[PDB]
Amino acid sequence: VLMTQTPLSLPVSLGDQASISCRSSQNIVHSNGYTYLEWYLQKPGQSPKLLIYTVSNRFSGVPDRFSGSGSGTDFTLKISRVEAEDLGVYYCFRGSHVPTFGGGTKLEIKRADAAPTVSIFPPSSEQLTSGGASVVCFLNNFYPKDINVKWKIDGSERQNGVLNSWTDQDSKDSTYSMSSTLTLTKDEYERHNSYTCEATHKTSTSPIVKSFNRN
Amino acid sequence: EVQLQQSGTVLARPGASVKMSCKASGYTFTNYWMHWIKQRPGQGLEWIGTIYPGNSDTTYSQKFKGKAKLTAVTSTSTAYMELSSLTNEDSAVYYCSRRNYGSSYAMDYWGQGTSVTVSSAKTTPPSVYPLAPGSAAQTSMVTLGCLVKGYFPEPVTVTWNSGSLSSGVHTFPAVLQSDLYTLSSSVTSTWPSETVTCNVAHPASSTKVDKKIVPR
DNA sequence: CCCGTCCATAATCACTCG
DNA sequence: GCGAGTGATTATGGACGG
C-alpha cells in the first residue's frame, strides 16, 4: 500500500526539464472518481509547501513551470524549466484512505565538475591538555557530491574514529562541502608524526593529498 | 489569513513523554481535518494521523497507534499531540497542517514545526577550539577554521567576527560525538595581519565565547 | 448462516433539481 | 416523468472461506 518515488535524486541543468516519478503498489483512485494524489516541496530549513493536488491542479502561488500528471498507479511531476530556486526534496503523497508520503526525490542543480579544495588542520594547543586531539580536514566547494575521504597516520590508513558532515548543495554556486575530523587521544596523537587527508573525486583517478607533521 | 503556530523546541528523556501544540487561527477550526507529520533528521516526511476538531474523530497511521495521541480544544482553536515512552526514534521535527477543501483538496497550510529531542544526556557548554593552517601546503586566499564540540544541546550561534564575514564560510551540521554534538566552521592574506577570530555562542549553556585564531 | 481477513478501488452512482 | 445537474479528502462494501 506504499508509494515509491524515482529517482532518489534528480540532477537537472538550469533551464532544462526535470521530471520526478511516483508509483503506487496499486490503484489509488477514491470510490468517487477523484484521485487524491499530491506533490509537496520542502526546502532546507523550511516547512513542506503544497505544489499540486488531485494529480494536476496547480495550487495558487505556485510557479507555472510546475505541472503534474498520471492515473491509477503512475503519476508525474514536471518542472518545465528548472530555476536555481527549485532545489529541495519533492514528495508525492496519497491523501485518501490511509494517507502516505512518497520517499521523496532530492533536486540538485546539475553544474560543471569541481575538485575538493582541501586544507588540513593540526589539533589546537588548547585542546591537547584538555583531553584529546582533533585533526580536521575541510573539503570545500566541489561537484558532483559523490566523494570519499581516507585518513592516514604515518602513511597508514586511519578509518576508525572519524566524523564527517556534509552541507546541502549551495544554492548560489551549486557545490557541496564536507568536513572530516579525526579524534585521537592526546597520548595517541603524540605517538605519531604524519597526518594526511586524501579525497577521491570523479574528476580523475588521481587523489588530492594534503598533509602536515607536528613540526 | 490561515496560520498555524506550534509550540517551541523540546527535550525529553528516554521513557519520558511529550505534549506539543498547534494553535490555529484565520479559519473555522471545527470544519477541517488537522494533520500531523513527522520527519527525523535527514529522513523523509512520515504521516502520523489526523483529527477532526468538529467531533474529535481521529485516525492513526498503524505505526503510531498508542505512540501518538491527538486532541483538540475547540474554544481555543488549538490541536495537541502527545508522544509516549519516547525513544531515540521519536527525535524529530513534528508538523501540523490543515487539510483544505473547496478551493483545493490537500494540506495547504503548515505549522513551522516542533523539534523534539530524546536523550538522557545533560546540558553542557561548548569547547570552541581555534584552528589555523599548519603551513605545509601550496597556497592568494587561506582557509582557517573553528571547531565546536562536546556541547549539548542544539543549537550553537556560530558567527565570524560578530557577523562581519559570511562568504567563504562553511558551517557544518552538528554531528553526534558521544552524547554531545560537535560542529565546525572554515573561513575563506589579510590574516594574520588583521584580526579574524571565532564568535561562538550557546543559548542553552547561556554562554558566549570568542576564540581568536592565533598562528602556531 | 455468523464472522474475521483479504481485496481492489472511476460519481458509467444515487438522487434532488427543473 | 424523465434527462440534465451535482456532489469530493481525514476508508469500505463485497467477495471469500473457515
Q: Beta-carbon neighbour count of residue B103 at 10 Å?
A: 8
List phi, psi (to 5°) of B160.
Answer: -110, 110
Residue in this structure with the C-alpha cell 549551495, named with its chain if needed: A170
- Specify the amino acid at residue A100: T
Q: How far apart are CA A160 and CA A65, in angstroms?
A: 47
- The Cβ-side half-sphere exposure at A140, using a 13 Å CA radius, reads 21
Q: How far apart are CA A99 and CA A97, in angstroms?
A: 6
Which CA-bearing residue is nearest the C1' of D7?
Answer: A32
Superfamily of domain A113-212: Immunoglobulins (2.60.40.10)
Please state the length of chain A: 215
**SS3 letters across A40-93:** EEECCCCCCEEEEECCCEECCCCCCCEEEEEECCEEEEEECCCCHHHCEEEEEE
Complete DSSP assignment for B25-62: ESS-GGGS-EEEEEE-TT---EEEEEEETTTTEEEE-G
List phi, psi (to 5°) of A11.
Answer: -100, 120
Nucleic strand C under 7 Å from the C-beta of A60: no
List phi, psi (to 5°) of A124.
Answer: -70, 140
Q: Nearest CA to CA, how far is A16 from chain B (Å)?
A: 26
Please state the length of chain B: 216
Q: Which set of grid coordinates corresponds to residue B125? A: 557548554
| Cα–Cα nearest to A62, from A45, A41, A43 | A41
Q: What resolution (Å)?
A: 2.5
A194 vs B: CB within 8 A: no
Q: Is the domain covering A1-111 a CATH 3.40.190.10 domain? A: no
* Under 8 Å between Cβ of B4 and B78: no
Nucleotide nearest to B105 (CA to C1'): D9
| Cα–Cα nearest to A136, from B54, B110, B182, B113 | B182
Q: Residues near B132 by Cβ (< 8 Å), separated by ≥ 6?
A: A121, B144, B145, B192, B213, B214, B215, B216
Q: How far apart are CA B143 and CA B186, in angstroms?
A: 6
Domains of chain B: 1-120 (2.60.40.10), 121-215 (2.60.40.10)
A1-111 and A113-212: identical CATH topology: yes
Experimental technique for the deposited model: X-ray
* Under 8 Å between Cβ of A100 and A3: yes
- Specify the amino acid at residue B143: T
Q: How far apart are CA A181 and CA A183, in angstroms?
A: 6
Q: Which of B132, B135, B173 sits opposite A165 (nearest CB)?
A: B173
Residues in A touching B103 (Cβ below 8 Å): 60
Nucleotides of C under 7 A from a protein CB: 8-12
- Residues of A 81-140 whose CB lies less than 7 Å from any atom of strand C: 97
* Under 8 Å between Cβ of A89 and A44: no
Q: Beta-carbon neighbour count of residue A106 at 10 Å?
A: 16
* Under 8 Å between Cβ of A161 and A189: no
Q: How far apart are CA B11 and CA B169, in angstroms?
A: 30
Q: Which set of grid coordinates corresponds to residue A131? A: 583531553
List phi, psi (to 5°) of B161.
Answer: 65, 50
Q: Domain ranges in chain A? A: 1-111, 113-212
Residues in B touching A167 (Cβ below 8 Å): 170, 172-173
